[PDB]
Short mmCIF file of C-alpha atoms in Angstrom, two decimals:
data_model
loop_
_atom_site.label_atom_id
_atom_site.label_comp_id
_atom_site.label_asym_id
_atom_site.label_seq_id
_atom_site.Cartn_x
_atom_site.Cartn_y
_atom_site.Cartn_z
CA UNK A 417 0.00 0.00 0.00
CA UNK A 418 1.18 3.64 -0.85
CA UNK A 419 0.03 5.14 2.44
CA UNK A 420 1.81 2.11 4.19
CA UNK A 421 0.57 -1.02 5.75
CA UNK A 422 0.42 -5.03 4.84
CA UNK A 423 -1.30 -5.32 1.05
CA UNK A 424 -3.79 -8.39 1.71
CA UNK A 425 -5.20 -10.04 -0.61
CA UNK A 426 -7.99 -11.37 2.01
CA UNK A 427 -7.91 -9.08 4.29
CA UNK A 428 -9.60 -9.04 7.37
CA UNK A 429 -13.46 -9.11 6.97
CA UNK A 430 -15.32 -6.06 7.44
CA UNK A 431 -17.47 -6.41 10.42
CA UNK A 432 -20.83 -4.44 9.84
CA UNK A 433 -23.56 -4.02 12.53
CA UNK A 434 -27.02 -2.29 12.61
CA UNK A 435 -29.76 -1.69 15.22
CA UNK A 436 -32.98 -4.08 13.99
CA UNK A 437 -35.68 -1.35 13.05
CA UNK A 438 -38.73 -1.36 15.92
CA UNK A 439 -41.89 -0.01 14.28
CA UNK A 440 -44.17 2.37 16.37
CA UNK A 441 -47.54 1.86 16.04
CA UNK A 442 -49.22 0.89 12.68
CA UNK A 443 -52.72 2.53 12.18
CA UNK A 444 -55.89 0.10 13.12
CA UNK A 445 -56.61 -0.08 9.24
CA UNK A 446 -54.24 -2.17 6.99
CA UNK A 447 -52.18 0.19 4.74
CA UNK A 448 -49.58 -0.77 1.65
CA UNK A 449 -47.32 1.78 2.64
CA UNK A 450 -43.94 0.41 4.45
CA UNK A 451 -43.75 1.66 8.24
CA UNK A 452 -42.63 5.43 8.43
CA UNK A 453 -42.36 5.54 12.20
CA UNK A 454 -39.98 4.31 14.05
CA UNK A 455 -39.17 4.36 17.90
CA UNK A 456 -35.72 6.16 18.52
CA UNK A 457 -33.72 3.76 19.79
CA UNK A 458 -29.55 2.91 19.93
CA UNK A 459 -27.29 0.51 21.45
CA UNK A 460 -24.05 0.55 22.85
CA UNK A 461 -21.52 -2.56 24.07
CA UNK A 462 -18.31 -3.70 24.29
CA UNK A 463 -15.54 -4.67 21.86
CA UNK A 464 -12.76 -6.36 21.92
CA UNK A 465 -9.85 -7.29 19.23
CA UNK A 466 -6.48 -9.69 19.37
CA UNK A 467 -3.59 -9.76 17.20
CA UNK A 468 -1.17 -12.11 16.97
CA UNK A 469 2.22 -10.65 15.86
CA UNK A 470 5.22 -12.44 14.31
CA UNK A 471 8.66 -10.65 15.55
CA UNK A 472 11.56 -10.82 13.79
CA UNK A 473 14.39 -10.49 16.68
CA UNK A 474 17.24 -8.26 15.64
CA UNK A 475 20.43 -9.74 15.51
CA UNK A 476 23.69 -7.66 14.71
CA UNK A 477 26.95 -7.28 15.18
CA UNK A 478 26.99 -3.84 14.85
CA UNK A 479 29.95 -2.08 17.71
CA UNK A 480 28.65 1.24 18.66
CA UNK A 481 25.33 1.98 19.94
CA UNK A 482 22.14 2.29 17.86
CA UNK A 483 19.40 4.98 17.68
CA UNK A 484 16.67 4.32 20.04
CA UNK A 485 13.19 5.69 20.64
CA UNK A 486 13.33 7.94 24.08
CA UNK A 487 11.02 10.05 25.44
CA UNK A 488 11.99 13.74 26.25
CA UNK A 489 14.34 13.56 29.39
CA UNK A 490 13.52 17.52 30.37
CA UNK A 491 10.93 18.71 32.37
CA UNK A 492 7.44 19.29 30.70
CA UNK A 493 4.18 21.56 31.66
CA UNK A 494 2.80 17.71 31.31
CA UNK A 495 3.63 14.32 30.58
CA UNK A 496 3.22 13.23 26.65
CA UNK A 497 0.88 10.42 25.52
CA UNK A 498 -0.71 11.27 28.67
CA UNK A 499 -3.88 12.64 29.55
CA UNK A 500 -3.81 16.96 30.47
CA UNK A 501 -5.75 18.54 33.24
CA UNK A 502 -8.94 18.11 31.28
CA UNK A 503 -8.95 14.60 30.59
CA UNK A 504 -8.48 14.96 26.95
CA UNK A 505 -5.72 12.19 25.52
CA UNK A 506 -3.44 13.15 23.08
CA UNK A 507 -0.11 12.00 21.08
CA UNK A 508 2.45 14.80 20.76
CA UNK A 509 4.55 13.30 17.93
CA UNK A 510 3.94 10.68 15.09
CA UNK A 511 6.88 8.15 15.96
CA UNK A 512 7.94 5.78 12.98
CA UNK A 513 9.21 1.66 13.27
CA UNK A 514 12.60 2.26 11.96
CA UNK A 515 15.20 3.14 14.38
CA UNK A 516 17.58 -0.17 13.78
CA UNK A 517 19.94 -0.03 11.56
CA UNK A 518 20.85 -3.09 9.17
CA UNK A 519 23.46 -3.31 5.97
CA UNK A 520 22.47 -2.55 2.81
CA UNK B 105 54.37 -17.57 9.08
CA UNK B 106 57.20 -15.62 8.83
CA UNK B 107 58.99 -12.68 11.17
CA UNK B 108 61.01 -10.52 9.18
CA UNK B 109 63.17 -7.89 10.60
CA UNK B 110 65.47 -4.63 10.04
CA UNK B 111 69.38 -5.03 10.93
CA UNK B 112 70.84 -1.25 9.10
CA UNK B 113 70.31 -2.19 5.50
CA UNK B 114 70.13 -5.99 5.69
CA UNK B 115 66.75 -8.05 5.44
CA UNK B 116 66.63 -11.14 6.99
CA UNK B 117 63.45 -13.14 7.39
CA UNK B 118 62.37 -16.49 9.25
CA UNK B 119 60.20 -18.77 10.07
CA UNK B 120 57.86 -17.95 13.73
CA UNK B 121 56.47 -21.84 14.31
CA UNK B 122 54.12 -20.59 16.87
CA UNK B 123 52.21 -18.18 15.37
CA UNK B 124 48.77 -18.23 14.23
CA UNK B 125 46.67 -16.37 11.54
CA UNK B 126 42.83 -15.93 12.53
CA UNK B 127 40.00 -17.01 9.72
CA UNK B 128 35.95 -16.92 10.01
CA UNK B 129 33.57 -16.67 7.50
CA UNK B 130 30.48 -14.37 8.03
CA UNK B 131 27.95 -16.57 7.05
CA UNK B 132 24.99 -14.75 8.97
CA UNK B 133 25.54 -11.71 6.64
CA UNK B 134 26.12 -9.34 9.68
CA UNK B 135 28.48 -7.26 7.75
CA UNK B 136 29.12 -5.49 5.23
CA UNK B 137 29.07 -7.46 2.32
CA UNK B 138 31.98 -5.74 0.07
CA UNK B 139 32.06 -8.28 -3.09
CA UNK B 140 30.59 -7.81 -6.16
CA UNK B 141 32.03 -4.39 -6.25
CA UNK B 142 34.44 -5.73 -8.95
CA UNK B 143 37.08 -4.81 -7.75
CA UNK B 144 40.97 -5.94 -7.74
CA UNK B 145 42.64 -8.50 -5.37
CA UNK B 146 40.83 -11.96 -6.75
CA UNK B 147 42.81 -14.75 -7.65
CA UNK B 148 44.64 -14.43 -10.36
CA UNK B 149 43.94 -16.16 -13.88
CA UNK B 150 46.99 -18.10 -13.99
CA UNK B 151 47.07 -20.91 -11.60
CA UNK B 152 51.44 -19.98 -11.30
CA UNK B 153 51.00 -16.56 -10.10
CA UNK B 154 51.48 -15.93 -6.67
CA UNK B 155 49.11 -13.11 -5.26
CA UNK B 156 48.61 -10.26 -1.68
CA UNK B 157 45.42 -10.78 -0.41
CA UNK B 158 43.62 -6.88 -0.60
CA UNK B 159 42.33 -4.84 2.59
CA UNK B 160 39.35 -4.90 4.24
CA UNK B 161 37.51 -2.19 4.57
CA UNK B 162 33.76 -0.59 4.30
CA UNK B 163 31.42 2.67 4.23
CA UNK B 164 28.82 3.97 6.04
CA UNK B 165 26.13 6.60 5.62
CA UNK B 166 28.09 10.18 5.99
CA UNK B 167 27.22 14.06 5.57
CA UNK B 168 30.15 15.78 4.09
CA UNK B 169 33.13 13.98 5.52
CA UNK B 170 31.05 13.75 8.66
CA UNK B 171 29.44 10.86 9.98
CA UNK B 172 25.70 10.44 11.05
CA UNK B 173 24.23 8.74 13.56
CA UNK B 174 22.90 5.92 11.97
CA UNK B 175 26.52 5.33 10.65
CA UNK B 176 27.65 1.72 12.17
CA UNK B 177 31.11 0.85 13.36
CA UNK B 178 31.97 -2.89 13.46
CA UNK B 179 34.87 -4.75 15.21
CA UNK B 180 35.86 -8.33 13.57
CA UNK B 181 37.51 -9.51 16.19
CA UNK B 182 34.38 -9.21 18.01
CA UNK B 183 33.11 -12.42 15.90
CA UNK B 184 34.21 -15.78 16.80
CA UNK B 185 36.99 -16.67 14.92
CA UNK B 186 39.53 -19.43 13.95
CA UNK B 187 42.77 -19.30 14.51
CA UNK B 188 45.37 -21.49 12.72
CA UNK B 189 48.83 -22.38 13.26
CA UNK B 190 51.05 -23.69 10.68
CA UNK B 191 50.56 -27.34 10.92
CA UNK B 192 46.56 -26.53 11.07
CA UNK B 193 44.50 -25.73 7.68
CA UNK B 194 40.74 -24.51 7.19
CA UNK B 195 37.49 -25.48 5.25
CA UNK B 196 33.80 -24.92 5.13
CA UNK B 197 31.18 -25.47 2.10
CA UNK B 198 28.45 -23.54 0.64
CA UNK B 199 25.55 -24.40 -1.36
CA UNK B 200 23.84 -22.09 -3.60
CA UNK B 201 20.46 -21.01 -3.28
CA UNK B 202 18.38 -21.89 -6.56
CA UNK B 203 19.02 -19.23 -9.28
CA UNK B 204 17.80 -19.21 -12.90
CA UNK B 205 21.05 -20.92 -15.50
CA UNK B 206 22.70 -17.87 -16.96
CA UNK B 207 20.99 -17.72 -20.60
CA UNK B 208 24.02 -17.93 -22.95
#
């Protein structure tokens, strides 16, 4: 894929989900017309997803030290990927997978 | 193995029965791989010509004559090695992974 990401072929199914239409209440005299009125109605849940990943374990021979993700070592107003005094979440930086180094 | 040494302007050399010479092949690929850059130092054509093995060396990424820091250093004598004295001698085989006949 151009924007990045696993090209699949089959990839995973795409789960869809509706809430089953409740009809208020027909007139007392049959009618052709398909039910116009509906009760207002939602639903909420819970979801839950697993992946199962397949690592491949770096192994190098490499002398000096590599490049390594780490998080800002100076003080900060707060802390990042971490909720603020409102409760609103938010990610400070997008952060990439490639910080080992192999050979050409 | 031989010692040779520096007397004014005389050369003598001789034989050191003791010492060793130090042999591994990188067969995990861990460095970098500097054949195929066609260049000098193979053996040569003519099975009576005697020939100096050529120096090892490699690049890394740079700016300028400066280095980056992605840019790895390796050590090979931080691999496990062999080391051979003069009565000792050295092997290993390879097999080559499948790869279309050369159309000629």
């Amino acid at each position: 894929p151009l924007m990045g990401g696993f090209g699949l072929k089959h990839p995973p199914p795409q789960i869809l989900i509706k809430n089953t239409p409740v009809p208020a209440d027909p007139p007392t005299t049959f009618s052709q017309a398909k039910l116009a009125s509906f009760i207002t109605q939602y639903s909420t849940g819970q979801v839950s997803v697993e992946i199962e990943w397949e690592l491949q374990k770096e192994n190098s021979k490499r002398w000096n030290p590599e490049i390594q993700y780490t998080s800002n070592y100076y003080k900060s107003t707060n802390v990042d990927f971490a909720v603020n005094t409102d409760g609103t979440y938010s990610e400070p930086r997008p952060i990439g997978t490639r910080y080992l180094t192999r050979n050409l | 193995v031989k010692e040779v040494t520096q007397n004014e302007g005389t050369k003598t050399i001789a034989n050191n029965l003791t010492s060793t010479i130090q042999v591994f092949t990188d067969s995990e690929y861990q460095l970098p791989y500097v054949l195929g850059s066609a260049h000098q130092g193979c053996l040569p054509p003519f099975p009576a010509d005697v020939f100096m093995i050529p120096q090892y060396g490699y690049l890394t990424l740079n700016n300028g004559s400066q280095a980056v820091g992605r840019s790895s250093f390796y050590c090979l004598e931080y691999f496990p090695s062999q080391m051979l004295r003069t009565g000792n001698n050295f092997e290993f085989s390879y097999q080559f992974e499948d790869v279309p006949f050369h159309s000629s």
